[PDB]
Design a binder for this molecule. Structure first.
Ligand code: B12
Ligand code: QSH
Ligand code: SF4
Ligand code: SF4
Ligand code: NA
Length: 700
């Protein structure tokens, strides 16, 4: 596998994007000409997904406009910086290409707010589709303009919302709902040129769709592409991607592998029948959803301050606030628990092996980074809901599990617990919920009960499903599983379904041995919540149990950022997607004698250092509905020194297995103060995985 970047983007600012657009021939202006956006070649069947992407696009269309916050005193005046920040924001949300142009009076002449002076124009490339006769092609064929339009609506809704929260009027636009000429602005803003009356964008050879955010927030504008001849797309520097940009051969190489296999070579990872850590199903008790520690915080179990801050902590930054409406309003579309009758739609659904591939291909098409499938075992479901306290049924047979990468480059510039941390969480949550909502819906159209399980609302615990789906191994971080290619840098989305699918198997890439000789995450945790010691048994399975009380308290109540995820940032497996980055992961996996050295050199080379070039976001905290400079400051953490040879023996953490949780009937209306002293003792009394194995062997 040769398609990864040879060159690092460490010195590339985020506003420049993954493409070498700065190397393309440009002119000051070009003459407008009529043009339309790319469309699908083939039309979409009745047995296709089109209705579902159209529904989510309609949902997001609701947030293209909204209320404008009061203007605070903390927004940068410089339009160049403003432009950079907004381009970076759009790339962070996976715009393919971004540009900015001035609006003229023909543009405001229409329904568009006449206060609007500038447009942020972005393109999203068409998804890859399954080749003909591949599983799921008929689900997907002819849905790409609409699938891509949904993504545009989503991005335009978030970005327009972000600028409105900074105190500037702003409106998002896309094909389904636009007040301006999208194609005309794509050309002016320098993303496309016209060929035979249709837009053609350098680099985006699969076709694409547009979004726009028009606004009075003044921005430095871009220049159009030279209107004729060669733009420089194949120049040697662009082709090799010398500045850290996407290699010219990458698209072609990637199209060589089937869509259903994903971009990362997970087929090269060793599969195993039982997972790499002990799982004793007969001893796994089910947990009240009221024992989720965010619910415990919400109910008063962790004290007043945590209770107060529980709703607010991830929504302190305008960007996150821009996502909130989409996140909350997707919840009613999550789907059904009741058995459905097969509708005959969806093609040949008799091979589970092909259904698995179809579902995978579907997820990758929609933008998942990993897709894995396991049985939705009943102990993966919460025991009861936190609102009424009613039992939750194990209503579906299968879990489809997908990982959304939280973003390497952004996190590289971040402290992990600064003003962007929750935006990295919420982006990944929002994108995952959108994708799983669409896929669950499609399953329903085919007559197979399906429900997604998001941040806002899950009735399963994702972790054991990530494990059983072969998407990660247990890591020291604790309540995070670690994937061999994106490390711990993900959020999962799960949807459960009755659709028959062949299931994946657990993976073994040596992580247990690796984490046994690493402590980096533990050392770098602001509240010392991560264990420096050995794995323990906990509710019938082997785990490194973090202190979820301390972590929750820090994430919810710390005031120098918006939440925390520093532990993902500091992990050696959190690496750049270069040849060297991949080689270090391949070595970690394949060469045990090298692991200690890799661990040590991760620190010697100061990996985890904050990269000032990558800090593209504004430090803004919304207090009382108005964005301002941070009241208490901003975490700007650096690599930390060793804790000691004896820390694993001396650190005492608290654990909260079912016995110390609110029991299965309990609702948010009750308070159960966290029993920290009992949790300390519980941990001290936890059985060792060794002892457990001996114990289980004596009943064999
Ligand atoms: C509440 C919560 C937290 C809380 C409290 C956790 C708690 N124990 O209650 C806190 C604040 C600690 C938290 C923090 C973070 N978590 Co969190 N959070 C959850 C959430 C929303 C609910 C978990 C819950 O229901 N209560 C937990 C009850 C059941 O507690 P538990 O008995 O201790 O079980 C835990 C583990 O042992 C594991 N588990 C349960 N059964 C089994 C069985 C087996 C065999 C195994 C191996 C594991 C396992 O799942 C639970 C995770 O809390 C989930 C989403 C979800 N629906 O699963 C994520 C989730 C676990 N968080 C996630 C992440 C990434 C984080 C953070 C890195 C924050 C961030 N920026 O993204 C940190 C990491 C903390 C750490 N040191 O590991 C991801 C993990 C994804 C992954 N790659 O594995 C999840 C799945 C969200 C998502 N959709 O991706 N989180
Ligand atoms: O429920 C939540 O609000 C929430 C927020 C964030 Br930023 C993270 O990481 C989790 Br886990 C849960
Ligand atoms: S464990 Fe919780 S507190 Fe510690 S770093 Fe990871 S997220 Fe931040
Ligand atoms: S940092 Fe070291 S210990 Fe912590 S998870 Fe990553 S590899 Fe395992
Ligand atoms: Na790293």
């Amino acid at each position: 596998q040769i398609s990864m970047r040879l060159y690092s983007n460490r010195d590339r600012p985020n506003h420049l994007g993954p493409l070498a657009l700065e190397r393309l021939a440009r002119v000051d202006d070009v003459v407008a000409q009529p043009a339309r956006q790319p469309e699908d070649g083939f039309a979409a069947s009745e047995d296709s997904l089109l209705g579902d992407v159209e529904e989510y696009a309609r949902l997001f269309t609701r947030f293209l406009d909204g209320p404008v916050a009061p203007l605070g005193d903390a927004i940068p005046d410089d339009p160049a910086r403003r432009a950079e920040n907004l381009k970076a924001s759009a790339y962070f949300l996976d715009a393919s290409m971004v540009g900015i142009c001035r609006l003229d009076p023909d543009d405001r002449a229409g329904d568009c707010d006449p206060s609007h002076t500038h447009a942020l124009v972005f393109a999203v490339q068409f998804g890859r589709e399954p080749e003909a006769g591949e599983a799921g092609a008929e689900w997907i064929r002819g849905t790409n303009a609409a699938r891509t339009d949904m993504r545009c609506a989503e991005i335009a809704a978030i970005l327009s919302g972000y600028v409105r929260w900074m105190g500037f009027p702003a409106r998002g636009h896309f094909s389904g709902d636009a007040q301006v000429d999208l194609a005309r602005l794509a050309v002016r803003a320098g993303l496309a040129r016209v060929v035979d009356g249709v837009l053609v964008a350098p680099f985006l050879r699969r076709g694409f769709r547009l979004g726009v955010v028009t606004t009075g927030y003044a921005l430095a504008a871009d220049r159009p592409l030279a209107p004729e001849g060669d733009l420089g797309e194949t120049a040697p520097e662009v082709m090799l991607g010398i500045d850290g940009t996407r290699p010219g051969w990458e698209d072609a190489e990637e199209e060589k592998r089937p869509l259903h296999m994903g971009r990362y070579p997970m087929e090269t990872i060793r599969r195993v029948d039982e997972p790499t850590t002990l799982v004793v199903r007969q001893e796994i008790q089910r947990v009240a959803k009221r024992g989720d520690f965010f619910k415990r915080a919400e109910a008063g179990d962790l004290g007043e301050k945590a209770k107060q801050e529980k709703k607010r902590f991830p929504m302190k930054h305008p960007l996150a606030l821009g996502m909130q409406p989409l996140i909350q309003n997707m919840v009613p579309l999550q789907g059904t628990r009741e058995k459905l009758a097969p509708t005959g739609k969806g093609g040949d659904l008799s091979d589970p092996g092909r259904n698995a591939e179809a579902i995978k291909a579907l997820g990758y098409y929609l933008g998942a980074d990993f897709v894995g499938i396991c049985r939705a075992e009943p102990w993966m479901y919460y025991a009861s809901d936190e609102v009424e306290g009613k039992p939750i049924e194990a209503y579906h047979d299968y879990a489809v599990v997908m990982l959304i990468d939280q973003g390497y480059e952004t996190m590289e510039g971040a402290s992990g617990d600064d003003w962007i941390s929750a935006s990295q969480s919420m982006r990944a949550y929002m994108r995952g919920a959108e994708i799983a909502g669409v896929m669950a819906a499609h399953c329903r159209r085919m007559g197979y009960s399906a429900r997604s399980h998001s941040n806002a609302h899950s009735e399963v615990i994702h972790n054991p499903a990530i494990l059983m789906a072969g998407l990660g191994e247990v890591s020291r971080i604790g309540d995070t599983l670690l994937n061999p290619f994106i490390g711990p840098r993900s959020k999962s989305i799960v949807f459960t379904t009755d659709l028959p699918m062949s299931v994946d198997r657990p993976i073994d890439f040596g992580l247990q041995d690796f984490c046994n000789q690493c402590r980096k995450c533990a050392r770098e945790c602001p509240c010392n919540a991560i264990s420096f010691g050995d794995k323990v048994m906990f509710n019938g399975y082997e785990i490194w149990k973090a202190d979820v009380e301390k972590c929750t308290k820090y994430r919810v109540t710390q005031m120098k950022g918006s939440a925390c995820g520093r532990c993902m940032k500091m992990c050696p497996w959190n690496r750049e997607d270069t040849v060297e980055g991949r080689r270090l992961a391949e070595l970690s996996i394949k060469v045990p004698e090298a692991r200690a050295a890799i661990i040590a050199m991760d620190d010697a080379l100061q990996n985890g250092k904050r990269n000032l070039i990558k800090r593209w976001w504004f430090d803004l905290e919304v207090i009382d509905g108005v964005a301002g400079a941070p009241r208490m400051g901003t975490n700007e953490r650096d690599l930390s020194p060793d804790r000691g040879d004896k820390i694993g023996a001396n650190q005492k953490l608290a654990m909260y297995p079912p016995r110390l949780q609110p029991p299965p009937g309990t609702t948010l209306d009750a308070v159960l103060p966290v029993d920290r002293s009992g949790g300390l003792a519980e941990y001290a009394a936890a059985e060792t995985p060794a002892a457990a194995r001996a114990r289980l062997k004596s009943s064999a």
